[PDB]
Amino acid sequence: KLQESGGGSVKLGGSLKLSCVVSGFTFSTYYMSWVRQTPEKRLELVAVINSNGGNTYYPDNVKGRFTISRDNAENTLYLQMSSLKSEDTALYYCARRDYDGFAMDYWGQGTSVTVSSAKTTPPSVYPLAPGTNSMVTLGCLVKGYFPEPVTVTWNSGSLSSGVHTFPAVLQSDLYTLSSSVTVPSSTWPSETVTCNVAHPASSTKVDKKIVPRDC
Amino acid sequence: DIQLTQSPASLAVSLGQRATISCRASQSVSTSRYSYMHWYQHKPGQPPKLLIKYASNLESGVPARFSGSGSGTDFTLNIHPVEEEDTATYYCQHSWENPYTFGGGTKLEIKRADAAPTVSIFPPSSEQLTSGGASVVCFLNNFYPKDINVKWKIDGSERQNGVLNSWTDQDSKDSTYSMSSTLTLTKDEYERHNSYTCEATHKTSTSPIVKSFNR
Amino acid sequence: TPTPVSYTAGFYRIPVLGLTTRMSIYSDKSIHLSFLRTVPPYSHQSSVWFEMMRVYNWNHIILLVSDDHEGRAAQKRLETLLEERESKNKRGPKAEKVLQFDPGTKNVTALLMEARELEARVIILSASEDDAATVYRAAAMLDMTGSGYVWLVGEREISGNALRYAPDGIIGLQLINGKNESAHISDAVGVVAQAVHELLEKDPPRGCVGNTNIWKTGPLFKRVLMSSKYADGVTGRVEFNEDGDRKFAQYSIMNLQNRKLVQVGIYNGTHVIPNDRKIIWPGGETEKPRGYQMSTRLKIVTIHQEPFVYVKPTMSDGTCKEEFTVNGDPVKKVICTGPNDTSPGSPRHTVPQCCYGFCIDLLIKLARTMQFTYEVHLVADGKFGTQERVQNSNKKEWNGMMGELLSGQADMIVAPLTINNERAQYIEFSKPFKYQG
Amino acid sequence: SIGIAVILVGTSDEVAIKDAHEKDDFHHLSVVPRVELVAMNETDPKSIITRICDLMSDRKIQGVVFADDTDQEAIAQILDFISAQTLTPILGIHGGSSMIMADKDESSMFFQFGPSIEQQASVMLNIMEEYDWYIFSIVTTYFPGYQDFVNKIRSTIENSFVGWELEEVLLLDKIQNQLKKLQSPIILLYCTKEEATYIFEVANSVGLTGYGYTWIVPSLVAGDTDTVPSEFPTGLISVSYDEWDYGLPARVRDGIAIITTAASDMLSEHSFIPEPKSSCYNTHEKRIYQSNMLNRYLINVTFEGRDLSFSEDGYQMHPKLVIILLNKERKWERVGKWKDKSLQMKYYVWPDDHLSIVTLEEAPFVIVESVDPLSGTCMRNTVPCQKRIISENKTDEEPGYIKKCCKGF
Amino acid sequence: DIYFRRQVELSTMYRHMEKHNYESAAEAIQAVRDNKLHAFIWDSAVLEFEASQKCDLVTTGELFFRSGFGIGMRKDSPWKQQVSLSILKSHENGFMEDLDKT
């Protein structure tokens, strides 16, 4: 249906062109708008544009900050952000297609934009694996890096098994997290696994095997 | 502008019960023939899909257990029956002469499966000490409700400082919430203690569930 | 329904006959001038239900009106039908309570809760079949599908969306089956043939080209078509009236039998003829129950008026003070649930107070006499209540005690009942207990 | 640019349309309201519908503001059949494009100019309470909105102090006998103006036109004041629309101002202009949206003080009406001006038995009474008693026009 | 109020009654004791009982109206039976006079 993209890490006052791909419909038969969803569960509706762009609307904070544009051939209308601040750290979606129809009906999975002035860094991942082995937990500590979002999957994306990814506290603007899965102790005192601590905003994919400290 | 107020923000009901989801406005948003609103749903990992139009009008094939009504400033929704698949993130968005105000946002819990979870405890490893931190990891996935009281203890000392939380959604296959935790220390305090333990209170645990390990 | 095709005919006026539709908006003689119909709109079954009294001698009904022109017009037709019994046992239709249907597209329980109280074993209405299917499970949850509850719906039930259905045994009707298109066409051909046999007693314009004048001979042909009686159609004698109105004086009566419309009988001119094969009821009965069960709870409203009523504040335990008479006998107390009204406006307390005076002991003696049970209330208005005009609706409405009793919200009233013509016009009265001036 | 269309069937006054256009002072413009058409002396409504398809082929049209120099409510019914069906909001200021009589659709968007029939009846109550006359009959033909009309008038009479106690209604859906049945010094009537010639012939046959009785009609059957039938009697007063000062460049500028203000709310608050349509049947796939397309900004508009709020009657809520009197030469002569619930004074021509009466205040035989300002100025059983305005003796001391009410022995 | 609205002669005083209308009977009871009000119109029984109980209050004339007190019943109620007959029975033993003695 739809895919909002073009996100990533950006500094305070920086620039970023957000992308919004049309997937499977004609594009100039309705009205467009764009929303941003905060991690604090607040709707930041960005802007309104027309199918010819003849009706561009911003709210007051978007006035003087952000810019909307059209790509009518590729059907991927863009939002060009500028003078970004920390309240713009949010997920970002789109909202369209009520067919006059002056509401909006199609929202997507979207992308994430974060606005912080810290330095992007690859993380330090170190395994958590007990050794009896009465109660076991196949985890890892990921600590001292930047930025969010964080995608920790296990065994190269083949094990779902209730992954529990952490929110952050920020020690010297390089935050720390953790990650933890438990398989039972009947199948793992020995069967070593890998772990994909993939941070897309850091653009890294590290590989750390989960080896037990004791037997 | 007309403002939307929704209650209860953390809805916890049982299945089969006619669950009432109220929405109160600050001004009448209707006329004789129609009204401007749209009520909808999504999972937090899912794209938003439209559910209810203008006060009540149904979209594509939602289960018809949901039945929304209300007019003027009041708006309701009857979920009869409730399914286990309703752990959703949702509200309605005000559109009456202003398609910009959005609802307060209520969240879904399911009062069905109260349980006591299995707890796994492991202090960090030796290769984990190269990062400088020390995270004693926890794990819990069989319990209701979501927000629990997590305590930690190191040789009798209360160590609520530096406690990381991870509350995830309740499983749609189990209706039980899931949580993992870490106790973030430094690398010097790890080589002086051995007993690192967590505590956690639920509905089926009058006493906090304590699990101790000897490092 | 091709509406503008009909609407174009209203300028170069053409006698038109309607084949299919039973919509009551086409009966409007202001715009739909010469638009006759082979089938009457659905208000004819209100006349069928006015025939249904003194079929089994039935005398109580509570109605639900679709908030639309259809239900309002059917209500007007049955209201004009109920203006009878001008002689010269008085067991005719007397319950006659009206509620509203169309806002029950979501919730009907506020109406059904009132419906289950007021001694109803009655049929109610025809409705939209979707909300009819909602009230079929709603009233079954409220247990209105019982044995004594007589149920009849009408024409829109027969549609397939009403199959969340109708407890087994509920009467349907078929007035005009009529859907032989040979019988639809050729009977109209005979009607217009008998018409033109008098239209030969000695020209419309060229359609929609410049001339917009009304062909007056069309409306002059309307009075001749007010005489074209065709007594020998395929559907029998074809009749008419001023606005459509086939006047088919026959129907056929069926009820459900495990969702099978098993025919119970027919109608013939003036004879409702039951081909009595099987009599089914929603509780699986075979009798013909009627009336209701008479209740015994009476909630009497009043205002504080010494020395008839002595509203007094109760003690800390909720009971009254054990006060005596002049001979040491205690005054009989009744915990009277008043309104909020411990202060003018809306006080936070809504406290049941005490009750002494004339009418308290009088009502206690009357309850011991008539041997019935007992409830109490006080009026929140505090006024006797006049027929004050409601603003911007030109309707004069009573207040006070008559704001509750004429609204049906209250039972019988003991009061300082000052008697006039209007209160006797709306409230039936006993003989004067205490003569006054 | 916003394609709008104006046509007045009959006029030749394009320079007034250019003066109403006047596109230089428009500092506050939306997308440009282009408007151009040509007139055609044709009453064929199917030709009008093919011209609607012609405007949709011209691809710019969304709504029109047009009229005709006839009195045909049938085309207003046609508008209710068609333009109220599809999309079209239409405002019409002339004659039958102003006179709406049959109904208003519930899914409608168009609107015709003029006040409500009960509002006009309220104007008649105002002027007849000024002249202290009382209707003691009523004759009325069959017309849409008649039972509620007589119910509203009678229910207004029931709340008053001095009312019109009459001789209840003779609905005319023995004509000379039925018109000889009711009698009144002042008679309130309604009849269709095409039938009113025959009805006034019957009234002349029964002599009701010759008894010194005055007849008051509403404006909708008081159609255009330049042609009166001879059987229409003399001395008839009526309240009507401003035919004297409200012409073409006022009405076209008012329509274009209402349309552009509805635009400059609809494309500004919501930043959403609707799309113009191309077909007259195949455009249905997007005009199914009985939706946010339905205008709320249409019912509340003012421009340079001239308000326009209108209810669901097809009539506005702030009308400006004049009161005209039919002379003996079949001439409608303006005698009074009715602004919003107020009257004007200048030409109170109130009209032998007429005898002058003088008196002096001596108790208890005389006025001990003021005039109540609100509820029936002379209250009950009290003749209005005019008094000379004793002013400064350089202007004229006005006889009358400060009044009291005489009770006394 | 309906009686004086119906009488066109009493319409002159009816506007003064509109000027000084009252919500409850206790207001008109206290107001003549505070001498703001000079007259209050009411049914005879309450006025005789209050003049007998409270002093400084007397009634001046006679029966300006003549009426009685009934029982309110919704129309065609089956309990219109025997209610006036029970009134006659309370008349038969003088039970109304026992209530007056009470």
Author numbering:
A (entry chain H): 3 to 133, 138 to 221
B (entry chain L): 1 to 215
C (entry chain A): 103 to 190, 206 to 319, 324 to 558
D (entry chain B): 34 to 206, 215 to 392, 403 to 460
E (entry chain A): 711 to 812
Copy the relevant paper text.
All of the subunits contain an amino-terminal domain (ATD), a ligand-binding domain (LBD), a transmembrane domain (TMD), and a carboxyl-terminal domain (CTD), which interact with each other in defined manners to mediate functions including channel gating, allosteric modulation, and cellular signaling. More recently, a number of studies on intact tetrameric NMDARs showed that the subunits are arranged as a dimer of GluN1-GluN2 heterodimers and that domains and subunits move in discrete patterns to control channel gating and allosteric modulation.
To understand the underlying factors that contribute to the different effects exhibited by IgG2 and IgG5, we sought to determine the binding site for IgG5. Although the overall quality of the cryo-EM density is inferior to that of GluN1b-GluN2B NMDAR-Fab2, it is sufficient to capture patterns of conformational alteration. The cryo-EM data for the GluN1b-GluN2B NMDAR-Fab5 in the presence of glycine and glutamate was classified into four 3D classes, where one corresponds to active, another is similar to nonactive, and the other two are similar to nonactive. This conformational pattern is similar to that of the GluN1b-GluN2B NMDAR with no antibodies bound, thus, is consistent with the observation that IgG5 does not mediate inhibition and instead has a small potentiating effect on the function of GluN1b-GluN2B NMDARs. Binding of Fab5 involves residues from CDR 1 and 3 of the light chain and CDR 2 and 3 of the heavy chain. e–f Surface presentation of residues interacting with Fab2 (white surface) and Fab5 (yellow surface) illustrating that there is no overlap between the binding sites.
